[PDB]
Design a protein around this ligand. Structure first.
Ligand SMILES: *[C@H]1O[C@H](CO[C@@H]2O[C@@H](C)[C@@H](O)[C@@H](O)[C@@H]2O)[C@@H](O[C@H]2O[C@H](CO)[C@@H](O[C@@H]3O[C@H](CO[C@H]4O[C@H](CO)[C@@H](O)[C@H](O)[C@@H]4O)[C@@H](O)[C@H](O)[C@@H]3O)[C@H](O)[C@H]2NC(C)=O)[C@H](O)[C@H]1NC(C)=O
Ligand SMILES: *[C@@H]1O[C@H](CO[C@@H]2O[C@@H](C)[C@@H](O)[C@@H](O)[C@@H]2O)[C@@H](O[C@H]2O[C@H](CO)[C@@H](O)[C@H](O)[C@H]2NC(C)=O)[C@H](O)[C@H]1NC(C)=O
Lengths: 258, 31, 259, 33
């Protein structure tokens, strides 16, 4: 997250950290959508271009965390993965269309002040909140700055970062990329005009794009960070997987394996 | 399970407290 | 160059290859504007972001080449550089504004069927040809395909590539990037709903963007590849250093450091 | 002619000079409107 701020304690209790077992490296972000289900971006698990092809054992999850370094005893929770589900029509060869994935935890996780699932949108909320201009919130541990030059070492956040980004108009961003933006995705980010800066970076992929419904005060996951570009050499807006648009699939998977 | 209570943060919505920037989200709804 | 084609012998006789002296590696593209002056992209010589800071003695230039593999008997010429000149207001930290540099050869190169200088536009030529929709030509030894994944090996063209690209409207260009595009630059490229594909890559930086004047049928160098995004993960259009916009600096240098 | 051969810049020996048109220069000419 570029130009964000430190997340307050328990500000994003659905925040999940995807890890590689060995070597233990933080890979992506993800979100808790129930005691046993975790939502993330498919290309975080499967992306041949970056030699990524992970199986349930290669990965490990960490929930409740707030500091990337310090171990938070009796606050954070580790969890192994039972099964990985990558959307069948996930197109990584072209535009990362349907860049979504579900991961069933081996054992359910206990909720607390630091761990709580986020709601998935329903037709009324998606139609009501998913509009241009409206702002959503993105969170994650990706770099604090540019990562297109050399070295990966610098720029790593010590504590969970957070930033609010406005939803971009479909045509406005289709014109910002030579990439085919499908209906299963939406863009978000400030136009260089607007003073307010802030953006998601690659290391934030799979993390949640949430919005707080003013109708019932509940936080909803409208998207998944599919392609943040705050840390790239260029990139006008970020690409997100339209969650509601793929809910039918999300339910099918859940309503069958747990 | 957890859906019945999804989207409600223990240290915020449950304690009737707001976070430092959620206000900014609400305001974006009002052009 | 991505989706281009092989250039014909003598098709771009003003084409110049910029090499690192040691280790010897091809760095950028460049163009011959005189028998002693070579035009290229400033970030080709100086770009801290990528460990690049060369001086006259770190470089070497080859002129008149068509094939990168075979040595071209009695055709190609190899030359050292006496001095290099990077535009004083060159901005590399933000948007490559004024991405242009001149390189003076140690000795004059001899023109031939395969080595000939390209023209520099005047106010009229620029105003007449630099218009959206009008196409220009780009040539270079950049990669032939995607270079955002691993390995640099595959994808290197054996012969000089060429591609014709349409100039893009400024507002349209700004819609595709978050970089502050200045009036000292322009864009070119096809729309993705293309019936025509083809774009310049990072490896083509410094190479020329030429247009043939329909009035006196001479080739003019309207721009310099500053940022080609054809091989990048994304990038709707390329950025070219507006040559006419920077002619005063060009002539100033030439006039002051040349006979 | 500033060193170069300004008087003759832009005219390729193997094309404009031999009155030969290259494979794709016409595509450029057609774009003028
Ligand atoms: C990239 O280009 C040069 C690189 O020059 C040097 O060699 C390269 C290979 C590398 O080792 C690099 O680190 C070396 O600098 C950069 O040079 C300019 O910046 C440096 C750093 O600020 C300048 O050094 C200063 O010199 C001051 C005066 O002392 C010097 O006086 C003359 C120069 O006028 C030299 O010939 C003397 O040998 C002596 O060192 C010092 O007061 C000051 O403390 C500091 O040491 C250097 O002088 C600059 N070069 C010139 C002459 O312009 C350049 O900055 C860099 N560009 C980038 C990446 O931004
Ligand atoms: C993601 O990996 C799949 C499994 O890869 C195998 O197991 C790895 C741990 C490693 O040893 C690798 O070298 C193995 O190929 C891969 O499936 C392919 O491999 C399986 C197992 O042998 C084979 O049964 C299957 O037919 C292979 N798939 C095909 C049809 O090519 C899978 O393809 C890969 N994901 C993609 C699509 O890149």
């Amino acid at each position: 997250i570029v130009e964000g701020s430190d997340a307050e304690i328990g500000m994003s209790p659905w925040q999940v950290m995807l890890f590689r077992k060995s070597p233990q490296e933080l890979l992506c972000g993800a979100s808790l959508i129930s005691d046993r289900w975790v939502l993330t971006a498919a290309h975080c698990l499967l992306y041949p271009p970056w030699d990524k092809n992970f199986t349930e054992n290669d990965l490990l999850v960490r929930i409740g965390k707030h500091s990337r370094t310090r171990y938070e005893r009796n606050i954070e929770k580790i969890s192994m993965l039972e099964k990985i589900y990558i959307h069948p029509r996930y197109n990584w060869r072209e535009n990362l269309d349907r860049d979504i994935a579900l991961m069933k935890l081996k054992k359910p996780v206990a909720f607390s002040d630091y761990i709580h699932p986020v709601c998935l949108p329903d037709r009324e909320t998606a139609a009501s909140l998913l509009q241009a201009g409206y702002k959503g919130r993105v969170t994650g541990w990706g770099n604090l700055k540019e990562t297109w030059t050399a070295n990966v070492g610098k720029g790593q956040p010590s504590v969970l970062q957070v930033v609010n980004l406005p939803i971009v108009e479909r045509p406005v961003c289709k014109d910002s990329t030579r990439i085919r933006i499908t209906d299963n995705m939406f863009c978000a980010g400030y136009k260089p005009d607007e003073g307010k800066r802030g953006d998601a970076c690659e290391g934030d992929s799979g993390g949640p794009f949430v919005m707080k419904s003013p109708f019932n005060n509940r936080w909803y996951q409208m998207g998944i960070v599919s392609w943040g570009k705050g840390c790239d050499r260029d990139g006008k807006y970020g690409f997100y997987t339209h969650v509601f648009r793929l809910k039918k699939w999300i339910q099918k998977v859940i309503d069958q394996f747990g | 399970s957890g859906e019945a209570d999804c989207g409600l943060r223990p240290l915020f919505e449950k304690k009737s407290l707001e976070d430092k920037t959620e206000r900014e989200l609400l305001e974006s709804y009002i052009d």
